[PDB]
Amino acid sequence: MFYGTVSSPDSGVYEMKIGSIIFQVASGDITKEEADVIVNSTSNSFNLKAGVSKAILECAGQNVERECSQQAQQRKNDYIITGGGFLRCKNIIHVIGGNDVKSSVSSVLQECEKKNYSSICLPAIGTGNAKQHPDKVAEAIIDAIEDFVQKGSAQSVKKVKVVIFLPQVLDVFYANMKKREG
Numbered sequence: 550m551f552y553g554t555v556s557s558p559d560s561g562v563y564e565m566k567i568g569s570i571i572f573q574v575a576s577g578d579i580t581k582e583e584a585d586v587i588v589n590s591t592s593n594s595f596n597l598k599a600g601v602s603k604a605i606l607e608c609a610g611q612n613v614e615r616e617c618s619q620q621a622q623q624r625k626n627d628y629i630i631t632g633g634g635f636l637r638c639k640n641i642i643h644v645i646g647g648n649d650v651k652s653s654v655s656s657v658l659q660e661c662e663k664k665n666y667s668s669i670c671l672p673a674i675g676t677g678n679a680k681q682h683p684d685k686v687a688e689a690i691i692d693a694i695e696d697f698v699q700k701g702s703a704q705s706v707k708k709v710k711v712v713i714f715l716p717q718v719l720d721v722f723y724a725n726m727k728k729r730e731g
């Protein structure tokens with residue numbers, strides 16, 4: 550109904566279509582990416598500095614750290630939106646690594662449509678400090694994108710890329726894409 554064919558457009562990168570969206574996976578350091586939104590996977594206090602969160606907060610800088618703690622004390626948030634700081638993006642969306650991953654990705658997609666953004670880059674949300682299983686995380690991320698497309702909600706969003714720290718976790722995402730392909 551929705552899935553295209555898996556191919557490799559560039560060395561180490563795998564892609565397929567999900568409706569109108571190009572979905573891609575690759576290994577590497579997410580802080581070197583350019584996109585309208587970069588996603589951080591953090592704690593419920595939005596002040597973790599371990600694994601991906603360490604790299605993101607150190608690169609983004611102290612003004613983004615302060616934005617995070619200020620919003621955290623104002624209300625109870627499931628996720629927060631800050632500036633990009635010194636990352637190559639327009640906004641960072643900080644999601645809670647222990648939360649339901651499908652729910653978190655659905656929120657990121659909706660927030661990106663609200664801003665008329667076209668590109669998103671995310672890590673393998675939940676597989677660091679939160680210790681969620683990589684196979685369940687891959688299934689949840691791709692399920693969120695499928696639901697978003699099925700509901701007719703993709704208008705501005707055109708590209709969603711997962712940049713993954715461990716090559717062994719990339720292998721799990723690749724296998725899930727091959728399971729789904731047309």
Ligand SMILES: Cc1nn(C)c(C)c1NC(=O)CC#N
Nearest residue numbers: 590600601673674675677714
């Ligand atoms: C970038 C990075 N460095 N380290 C040491 C780890 C575990 C990661 N990835 C995550 O934290 C996964 C998620 N979310």
Ligand SMILES: [Cl-]
Nearest residue numbers: 646675677679
């Ligand atoms: Cl995590």
Ligand SMILES: [Cl-]
Nearest residue numbers: 672673713714
């Ligand atoms: Cl990762």
